[PDB]
Amino acid sequence: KARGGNIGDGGGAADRVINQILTEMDGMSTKKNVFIIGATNRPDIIDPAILRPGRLDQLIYIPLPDEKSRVAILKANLRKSPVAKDVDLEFLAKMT
Amino acid sequence: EVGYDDIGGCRKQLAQIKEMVELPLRHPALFKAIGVKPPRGILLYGPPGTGKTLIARAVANETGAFFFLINGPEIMSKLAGESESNLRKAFEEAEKNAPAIIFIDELDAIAPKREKTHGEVERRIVSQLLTLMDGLKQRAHVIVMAATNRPNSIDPALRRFGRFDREVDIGIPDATGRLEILQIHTKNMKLADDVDLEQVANETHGHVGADLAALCSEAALQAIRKKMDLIDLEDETIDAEVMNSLAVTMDDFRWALSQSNPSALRETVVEVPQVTWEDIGGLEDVKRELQELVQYPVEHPDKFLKFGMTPSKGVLFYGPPGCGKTLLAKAIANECQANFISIKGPELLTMWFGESEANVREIFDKARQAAPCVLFFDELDSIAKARGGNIGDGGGAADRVINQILTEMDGMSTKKNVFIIGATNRPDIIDPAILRPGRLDQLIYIPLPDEKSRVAILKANLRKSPVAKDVDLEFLAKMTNGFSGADLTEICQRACKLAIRESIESEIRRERERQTNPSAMEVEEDDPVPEIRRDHFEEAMRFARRSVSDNDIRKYEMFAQTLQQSRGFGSFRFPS
Amino acid sequence: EVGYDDIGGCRKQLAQIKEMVELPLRHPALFKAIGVKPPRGILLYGPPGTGKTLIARAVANETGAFFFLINGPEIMSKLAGESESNLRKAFEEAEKNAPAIIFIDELDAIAPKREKTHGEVERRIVSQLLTLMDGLKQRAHVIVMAATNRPNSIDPALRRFGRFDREVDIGIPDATGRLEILQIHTKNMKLADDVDLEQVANETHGHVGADLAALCSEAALQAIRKKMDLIDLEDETIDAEVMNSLAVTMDDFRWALSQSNPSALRETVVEVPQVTWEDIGGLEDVKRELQELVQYPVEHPDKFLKFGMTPSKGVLFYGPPGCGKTLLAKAIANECQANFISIKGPELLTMWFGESEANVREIFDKARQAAPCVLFFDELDSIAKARGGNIGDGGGAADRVINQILTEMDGMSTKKNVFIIGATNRPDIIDPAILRPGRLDQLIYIPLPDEKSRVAILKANLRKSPVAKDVDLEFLAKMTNGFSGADLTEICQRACKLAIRESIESEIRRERERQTNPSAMEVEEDDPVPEIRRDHFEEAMRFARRSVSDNDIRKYEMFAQTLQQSRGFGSFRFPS
Ligand SMILES: Cc1cc(OCc2nnc(SC3CCCC3)n2-c2cccnc2)ccc1-c1ccc(S(C)(=O)=O)cc1
Ligand SMILES: Cc1cc(OCc2nnc(SC3CCCC3)n2-c2cccnc2)ccc1-c1ccc(S(C)(=O)=O)cc1
Ligand SMILES: Cc1cc(OCc2nnc(SC3CCCC3)n2-c2cccnc2)ccc1-c1ccc(S(C)(=O)=O)cc1
Ligand SMILES: Nc1ncnc2c1ncn2[C@@H]1O[C@H](COP(=O)(O)OP(=O)(O)O)[C@@H](O)[C@H]1O
Ligand SMILES: Nc1ncnc2c1ncn2[C@@H]1O[C@H](COP(=O)(O)OP(=O)(O)O)[C@@H](O)[C@H]1O
């Protein structure tokens, strides 16, 4: 994103930091314990080399929370705060 | 001797040092029966000439501890191999007179090594000093206080636990402290009645305690040169009565201020702004929202804790230029009585051009030290404008300085006191990451001042100037349909300029009239224009102009409605 | 011995040093009965050969203080471990003869460490010198004056409070001071009647006192070589009468000036401009506005203070090239009798290309020291032009040099004396931040000279040249419908060139005539063309040209009306 995304730089998707991350991952796996998890809101602009085998190949899509998921999120956010039982949370989650 | 009265500036770190050192020194026997570790070392740092040595001496005198002064270059000037003996003997002597205070003035000379560490013998001196400082067996009550211009100048191992574990930034004295410093430095010269030391104190921005003393001495010397020299009656010792007959006049102080050259004007200022809500005539919704966001967490922290809500620590003001965003930030800081730090756009542009963003880390650390503080990033969109705005660079909105600011903010919130306020006249080009949660998410829009707001702005601008009651201010404010605060200030300044020019020209002619035709009886009619009149304001308003066009206000209205709360929930009702 | 008469240049810092040192030295007993701290150290800095040591010696002689000279390399050339003894003994000896003055010539050798601080023994010397300098127990009246090329060359701890707390920049002598230096250096050579030392002084720009002495010596040696060598009558001691018979002619001085090579031409000049309002024929509205903005705050500061108005300290001249903006700035500086510093565009471009904007800080500090001063930034739009102007760089108008200038201006105004004047031929591309309040907000438009203004410009350009009364100047000025000041200067220069060529060719032919046909009786008819005539001016005007097209004047008119005072308030009346 910093380099662009629609036009960007004249060069390709490769950058210094991602290249170093790829080198470390390629030199990784020896440890058998470190597990790399990557989160990105712009999958289109992510470097394709990141998704090659031996890298973050398992792509997982996180969709918008469902009604039940929304209810759980509201409960988690409001667990600490004193919430009156009168306010129905399922209705609010479904409304959103 | 020297005491708290001598220590001027009322900068409120002397109180912190007192709270630090009384019990270790004022009640030394108490720590013998209680298991607690007192402050083994205190690092006083700040601009030179701020009285750090004076503060240490005053604390030593007021607490009865045996004060020992280890001058930096005094030991450094000694021959290699025997300076170490001097340092060791100094610590032993201070140990003997328990409790004792060992003050190391100019610590950045004994242990200047910042891991560069040039030379050989200086490495020995730093290591031996480290051994001594860490060698305090917690017996007796020797407290080692050191002076340094900046914390990072001394060796980092000196900053570690047990050597110097707590630091106090004395900093430049403020207007209130500058006035108190002037009072302390002007107490035996028999100051004149006309001179008040208040106007000089306000005009004395940028001076330090040493600078204030030098200015007072220069004014005294000007007084001595102006008078008592013409008579030329001098002896071995000037007569006390003859010297007392002179009074330091305001003119002498004014000349001295003109000849001051303060020794660190550039140094950043950490000061409680004097601006008040009165200066801003309105923004009641904005005023209440700012009061909420800033004041409520501190005034009523318990109620924030009860609901398990963490108050936002960032607010971004957006609006047309000249509407009072900087003034609003100063007012909000003043209401909470918290220190205010302002980072204008030139500083950010300098950090960006120079590729030196580590200054952001230093700025945030300074804001953290001066808590409670309101860290204001004025005109934060300057870097985006510098890179473009319509097309700009090929890359995105991310830049080095904003990225460093985001990193510091993400690593912030720990302090619980620093509050970040951002002002930007171009919200469209501001980096979106700035507005994410945990950052300056609370966007506040500052609109053009209303009629009542315009009246208040005019009154604030014209409070100092003599304004005749004939000139109606409400009519002028209402007449200005869309003038910004800057436009109103320009109108007031132009009216004052017209009045000043007319007064100067008139009294100049009147003086010709007395030179050309010497009148037999001298009878001055006073000033031909003693206050600003209706005609001056009419001529000034003739040149009134609207700096802010309606198209840029339209863009701001667009962004405001670009933060639109949806259009389907306005009638949300729970099922009952 | 040496005194104020020997000290030449009339540079007006000797007076400041006198005011500094009389009472501490001229009236030492006075400070015994009065509690005041005198100047413990004074740092004289400037280009080498400016007479700093001479000034110190003259002050010591004229005040009776025992002068002690501690040569930099004299102590530095001594063996390590015993040079410290030399410095300590020098201070003790100066202490014995109280009052005494200790002069440290070439201080940048004893303590050159700028925090780089190479070596080991030199660190000892700097630290011990620091201990001695700070070790002055305020007893006796020893004043330590030091000489250094630049303030930043010496160790910063030497610049701190109590070591060297006040600095004086002797600087390069000016035309008036160059003339006085020539007079002092030409007093025993029996200067000839034809030589006046005024033309040489004007042509002597760039020389220092040492340079002036060297030029005078070279002229004397040329005189000795030209005569008294042909006779070759020499003995053990040349006869006084024989040597007195020679007179240094203007030709010898001219040759010496040709063979001068001044030792610091590049050094920036801080000089009161000799230009006067007479050189500019008009701009009465502009002249009065400039008089207001600059002169009024100082001539009548009391009236500015009465109305609570702070006068603007920045003015931006905009207009077509060659209209006299630089001359106007020089004239305004001359009227106020304040030092003038000019920063032309090449300097800004050099700072921008080299990525060295810290020079702006140095320039502003120099302007601050030479107060009252008029800091003029000539052709400030050069960087914008260098980056483009129609498309330019992808980024905005902000650049490193302008940002540094803005930072210095924002940190300025404290001095109350420096006044910033900006000239730009491309107001459209100038950064808008430059025009914000607190910056060069007062925009002044310099239009093409009028008919009367053109007449005045022609008279000023032709004042030195011999112009025949036959050639009517008003007609020529009126004839030039839109010629700029530069165009008029070019026309005058071309006319002078034509006259010079005609005179040279004619006298050359006339000399052939005498060589070809030796006349029996020599009777020179004098010069065939003694002054500039109508035909020369007609031929020159034949090549007259309008450098400034009407389209760029149209753009300037657009910007001028782009600062339009609205169109609805012209009839503003208060309700009565
Ligand atoms: C047996 C095996 C274990 C392994 O590692 C297991 C492991 N332990 N800790 C961790 S990490 C920790 C767990 C939670 C956070 C991270 N892991 C691990 C490994 C991979 C992915 N996630 C975790 C690798 C590779 C192998 C094998 C597979 C086939 C053959 S053959 C010649 O074809 O017959 C030989 C060897
Ligand atoms: C109680 C609390 C106070 C706080 O800090 C208060 C504070 N003091 N000085 C300042 S600063 C100064 C004031 C004027 C200028 C700046 N602040 C402050 C904090 C935030 C925003 N503005 C000011 C933070 C967070 C909490 C909490 C909230 C919920 C829970 S739980 C587990 O859900 O039950 C636990 C802890
Ligand atoms: C009285 C005053 C003088 C001043 O400075 C005057 C000055 N002297 N040398 C110079 S410089 C030199 C002159 C020729 C070349 C440059 N100046 C000067 C100042 C501004 C612009 N040009 C010159 C500033 C500000 C003030 C004041 C105004 C209002 C108030 S109140 C609280 O509202 O009642 C308090 C203080
Ligand atoms: N607030 C103050 N009250 C009285 N004197 C002050 C004050 N601030 C600075 N000074 C002056 O500063 C002089 C030297 O400064 P100092 O105390 O040594 O600080 P530093 O070591 O940082 O330079 C002192 O002689 C004192 O007169
Ligand atoms: N204004 C002056 N009047 C008389 N002599 C001068 C003057 N300026 C410079 N000189 C000459 O400069 C010579 C040496 O320069 P000096 O005084 O030592 O200055 P610096 O130490 O900076 O080089 C002196 O011998 C003196 O003759």
Count Cβ atoms within 10 A of the Cβ of residue C64 and give its class: 0-12 exposed, 13-18 middle, 19 or more buried: exposed
**Is residue B326 part of an annotated ligand binding site?**
yes
* Alpha carbon distance C319, C326 (integer Å): 11
Ligand nearest to the CA of C314: 3
List of E strands, B319-452: 339-342, 373-377, 419-424, 442-445
Q: For A81, which residue in chain B has the nearest alpha carbon?
A: B307
- CATH 3.40.50.300 describes domain C4-169: yes
Mutate to test the interface with C, among B198, B199, B497, B549 (most CBs of C within 10 A): B497
Strand stretches in C319-468, DSSP E = 339-342, 373-377, 419-424, 442-445
Question: What's the CA-to-centroid distance between B414 and ligand 2, angstroms?
Answer: 10
* CA separation for the pair B101, B109 (Å, rounded): 20
Longest dimension (CA), chain A: 59
Resolution (A): 3.0
> Rounded to a whole number, what is the distance in Å from the CA of A57 to chain B's nearest CA?
27
CA gap C251, B564 in Å, rounded: 86
Q: Which residues of A touch B387 (CB under 8 A)?
A: none
Secondary-structure class of domain C451-558 per CATH: special
Cis peptide before B301 (omega within 30 of 0): no
Residue boundaries of the structural domains of chain C: 4-169, 175-258, 277-445, 451-558
Distances (CA, A) of C119 to B107, B158, C81, C124, C247: 20, 24, 14, 10, 55
Distance C353 CA to ligand 3 centre (A): 36
Phi/psi class of residue B288: alpha, beta or left (left: φ > 0; alpha: ψ in -120 to 50)?
alpha
**CB–CB of C528/C507 below 8 Å?**
yes
- What determination technique applies here? cryo-EM
Which helix (H) or strand (E) segment holds residue C384: the answer is: helix C382-387
Tell me whether residue B480 is annotated as binding.
no
Rg, C-alpha atoms of chain B: 30
Contact call for C292 and B120, based on CB within 8 A: no
Give the chain C residue whose CA is nearest to the CA of B51. C161
CA dist B237 to B224, B225, C97, C142, C343, Å? Answer: 15, 17, 20, 19, 51
Q: How is domain C175-258 classified at the CATH fold level?
A: Helicase, Ruva Protein; domain 3 (1.10.8)
Sequence-ordered alpha helix ranges (H) in C64-105: 72-76, 83-96
Tokens (6 digits) for C335: 């009227």
The CB of C159 under 6 Å from ligand 3? The reply is no
- As a CATH number, domain C277-445 is 3.40.50.300
Q: Which atom of ligand 4 is nearest to the CA of B170?
A: 22
Question: C546 in helix, strand or coil?
Answer: coil
Q: Could you check whether B4-169 and B277-445 share the same CATH topology?
A: yes
Q: Which of C565, C54, C563 is nearest to C316 (CA)?
A: C563
SS3 C134: helix
User: Which DSSP letter does residue C135 get?
Assistant: T
- Identify the H or E element spanning B67: strand B66-69
Q: Do A87 and B308 touch (CB under 8 A)?
A: no
Q: How many CA atoms lie within 13 A of C137 on its CB side?
A: 6
B314 lines ligand 2 (CB under 6 A): no
CA distance B574 to chain C (A): 52
Write out the H or E segment, with its range, that includes residue C167.
strand C166-169
Give the closest-approach CA distance of A24 to chain B in angstroms: 24
Asked whether B487 and B540 are in contact (CB, 8 A), the reply is: no
In whole angstroms, give the CA distance from residue C120 to residue C109: 14
Q: Whose CA is nearest to atom 7 of ligand 4?
A: B209
Measured between alpha carbons, how far is residue C404 from residues C281, C364, C370 in Å?
A: 36, 10, 20
The dihedral formed by the CA atoms of C20, C22, C25 and C26, expressed in degrees to the nearest 10:
-170
Q: What is the DSSP letter of B23?
A: I
d(CA C166, CA C39) in angstroms, rounded, equals: 8
Of the candidates B230, B457, B172, B426, the residue with the CA atom closest to the CA atom of residue B328: B457
Cα torsion C552, C554, C560, C563: sign: negative
Nearest to B140 by CA among B253, B38, B292, B211: B38
For ligand 5, the distance from its centroid to the CA atom of residue C267, given in whole angstroms, is 17
Are B366 and B268 a contacting pair, CB within 8 Å? yes
Instruction: List B residues 272-311 in contact with A (Cβ-Cβ < 8 A).
Output: 306-309
